[PDB]
With several copies, the nearest count.
Chain A
Amino acid sequence: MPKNVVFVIDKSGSMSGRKIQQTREALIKILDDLSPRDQFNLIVFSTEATQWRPSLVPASAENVNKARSFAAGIQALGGTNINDAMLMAVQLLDSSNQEERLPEGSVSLIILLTDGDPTVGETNPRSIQNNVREAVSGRYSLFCLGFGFDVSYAFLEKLALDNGGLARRIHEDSDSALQLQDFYQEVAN
């Protein structure tokens, strides 16, 4: 199946060093192996939420190269606004229902990576669980990646379970880029 994949990536100041490098390296390799029929976008979150294209764009040779350059250029931005980040990614996938009705037959997938708990905007985790499930409404699966042990993983597991997906732990080690690739290959096709 062609798929509509949205990646939501923490860019908190805690990601500085190996975690940001390994996350970027995994995203470059994931972008490089994307098929020409897929559609995608990238959301970064920190204290501020920022999106690469604000909508789903096709995995053209130009768009994949521009996305890889964006993945290389982005810098860390302090705090952690997980609620806005997820809602923005969800909003971009839900654009399929109205603005872009031609990719409705594609498989939609939302992938979130974080190393920490919410610290900016809505930080009540029960409210965030409500906000995500009411937005997604069972339309697609949410895969939450907990990078490290400095995060409430049970919050990430419950959120993925409520939305047709599963959570996965990424261990802070030398192989974290491979661990991200290994997980993505499970859901890539």
Chain B
Amino acid sequence: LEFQHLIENYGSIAPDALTVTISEIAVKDVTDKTGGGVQVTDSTTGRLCMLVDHEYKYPYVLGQGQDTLAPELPIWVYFPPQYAYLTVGDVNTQGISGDSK
């Protein structure tokens, strides 16, 4: 609906500002449940590490068309992607095979 309203009522769009808030953090301990399975409890000593890379120190992997986005519906839990990146290196011939790494 809001996108319909945007394109019905405005001549142009540009990005202006962004705020990301992480809230309601729960680091949850897991342990064995009575009768099998596991049970979960909230941890007062568990910590979530948050690193915001304002300096762009770390290889930027966002904006590559990858299947990593937040869920399209608000009823779905985001499972954020594992951070991994590609770097330059030297091509070494794998012995007699002529295959390369």
- Chain A positions within 8 Å of B, measured between CB atoms, are 13, 16-17, 75-76, 78
Contact = CB atoms under 8 A, between A and B. Distances in A.
B contact patch SS: loop
A16 to B, nearest CB: 7
6 contacts: A13-B37, A16-B35, A17-B36, A75-B36, A76-B36, A78-B37
Contacts of A76: 36
Q: Contact size class for B?
A: under 10
Interface of B: 35-37
Contacts of A17: 36
Contacts of B37: 13, 78
A1 to B, nearest CB: 39
Nearest to A16: B35
Nearest to A13: B37
Nearest to B35: A16
A183 to B, nearest CB: 28
A11 to B, nearest CB: 11
Contacts of A16: 35
